[PDB]
Structure 1
Amino acid sequence: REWVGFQQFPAATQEKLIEFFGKLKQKDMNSMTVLVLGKGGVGKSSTVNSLIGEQVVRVSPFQAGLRPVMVSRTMGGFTINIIDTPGLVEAGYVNHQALELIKGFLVNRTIDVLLYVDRLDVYAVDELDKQVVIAITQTFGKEIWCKTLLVLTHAQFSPPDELSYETFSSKRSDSLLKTIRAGSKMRKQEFEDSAIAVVYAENSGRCSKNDKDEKALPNGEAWIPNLVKAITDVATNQRKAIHV
């Protein structure tokens, strides 16, 4: 479908997205496919709707047995495909049936970028997070991690008491990255080489805006263009995409 949501982005965001997608088109990539994975309730669907700028997937405090969905939008000969998914944990365990459904849904498809999504405003990683990584590695292979971005939602979180945002967020992202390294079995150099970048998101209607009317992080940066910059970076990193 035509990309109506694009028209609703502020000019400053439009400008950046055109630059990013324009770079892909120059390399004769006239489309890209983004897979989104995560536990339930972390804002996967919300982040998808933020990226498309339309209500294309269902958001809810409760996890609906639901199926993967591909949302596709096209503009000036360029097409973005984003695959939203059911959560990867159920009742304190990894949901392997969800993973198999997702994998089944991906047959024949080429995945340019994985977004592995979790919340910023969480105080610990636990064994379940590592098991989610382990299961993703078993389903798609170790190589998925060289095409992945860690996306942390609820970025407008303000930590309690004396704690700085920067200390809290660097600890949260570090702990997750170390979990990815552990669950993927990657050696320290191998892991450094995968170069997994951390991107922040705030899907709340109450998100701060910068002075160009763009949804902004506490540092003032426009987060939707940041995330698109990171996606298009990974899409064109010349590591091989993920075929299933």
Structure 2
Amino acid sequence: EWVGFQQFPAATQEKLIEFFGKLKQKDMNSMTVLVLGKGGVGKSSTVNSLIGEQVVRVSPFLRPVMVSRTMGGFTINIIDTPGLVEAGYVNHQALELIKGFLVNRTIDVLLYVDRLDVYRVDELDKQVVIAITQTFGKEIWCKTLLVLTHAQFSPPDELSYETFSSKRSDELLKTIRAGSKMRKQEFEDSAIAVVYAENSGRCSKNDKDEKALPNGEAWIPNLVKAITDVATNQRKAIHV
């Protein structure tokens, strides 16, 4: 059984049950979420948050792991990956160790993880988005969510949270677009959503006990809702 689900706030559990329900009615009774990102960005910490338990390794400084948990006839399987940067360049080994582990699997969602609290995208970020396109295909971005960790960050000086985070995520979506060399046509129709994650224990709980963003909202319920939505978005899943 899924022990982490029993830890969640009454209100998170309730919402998750509602969301797996919408999938179950379409005959989906399992889904596989791949997690990809540059090293250091909180991929493993987002997976522990989602799973509700300490399942993958978390560190400042080989080889992909999968974590399946089941609840009420539904199975979430989430693949944590080694980071894709051996700085200051793309780590092509980690990136085909990942493909090795994915052969014969169906990936329903990609959580592309980066940090909110960063002031710029660079050429390495575009190199990473091209190394992902060269490995899984253009098609993977029709199945992607941009997850931005460190969501509780307060910018200095004093552009607002909402200026900072709209520019940050605008810059990252443009880097995905350019590195992907997707055409304007497939890109709007891909409409890749941006969900926010705060994995810190210092993280504001709202008044229903759920991990909340600055705007008030339970972020794990939003993350599972946007995942459920991409799992259901009627664009086709990725095989290999």
TM range (shorter): over 0.9
SS of structure 2 residue aligned to 1:32: strand
Deviations 1:8-45 (A, max 9, x none): 00011011100100111111111010000000100000
CA distance in structure 2 between the partners assigned to 1:41 and 1:119 by the alignment? 9
**How many Å apart are 1:186 and its aligned residue?**
1.1
CA distance in structure 1 between the partners assigned to 2:197 and 2:233 by the alignment? 22
Give the root-mean-square deviation of aligned CA atoms: 0.6
TM-score, normalised via structure 1 length: 0.97
CA distance in structure 2 between the partners assigned to 1:208 and 1:159 by the alignment? 17
For structure 2, the residue ranges without an aligned partner over 5 or more in a row are none
CA distance in structure 2 between the partners assigned to 1:91 and 1:209 by the alignment? 35
**How many Å apart are 1:91 and its aligned residue?**
2.2
CA distance in structure 2 between the partners assigned to 1:229 and 1:77 by the alignment? 18
CA distance in structure 2 between the partners assigned to 1:107 and 1:161 by the alignment? 47
SS of structure 2 residue aligned to 1:240: coil
**How many Å apart are 1:187 and its aligned residue?**
1.5
Aligned residues: 240
SS of structure 1 residue aligned to 2:35: strand
CA distance in structure 1 between the partners assigned to 2:71 and 2:152 by the alignment? 31
Q: Show the counterpart of 2:208.
A: 212
SS of structure 2 residue aligned to 1:20: helix
**How many Å apart are 1:189 and its aligned residue?**
2.4
For structure 1, the residue ranges without an aligned partner over 5 or more in a row are none
**How many Å apart are 1:74 and its aligned residue?**
0.9
Moved over 2 A (4+): none
CA distance in structure 1 between the partners assigned to 2:87 and 2:158 by the alignment? 34
**How many Å apart are 1:153 and its aligned residue?**
0.1
SS of structure 1 residue aligned to 2:16: helix
TM-score, normalised via structure 2 length: 0.99
**How many Å apart are 1:76 and its aligned residue?**
1.7
**How many Å apart are 1:163 and its aligned residue?**
1.1
User: In percent, how many aligned pairs have the same letter?
Assistant: 99
CA distance in structure 2 between the partners assigned to 1:90 and 1:158 by the alignment? 29
Q: Show the counterpart of 1:95.
A: 91
CA distance in structure 2 between the partners assigned to 1:189 and 1:79 by the alignment? 34
**How many Å apart are 1:188 and its aligned residue?**
1.6
**How many Å apart are 1:192 and its aligned residue?**
0.6
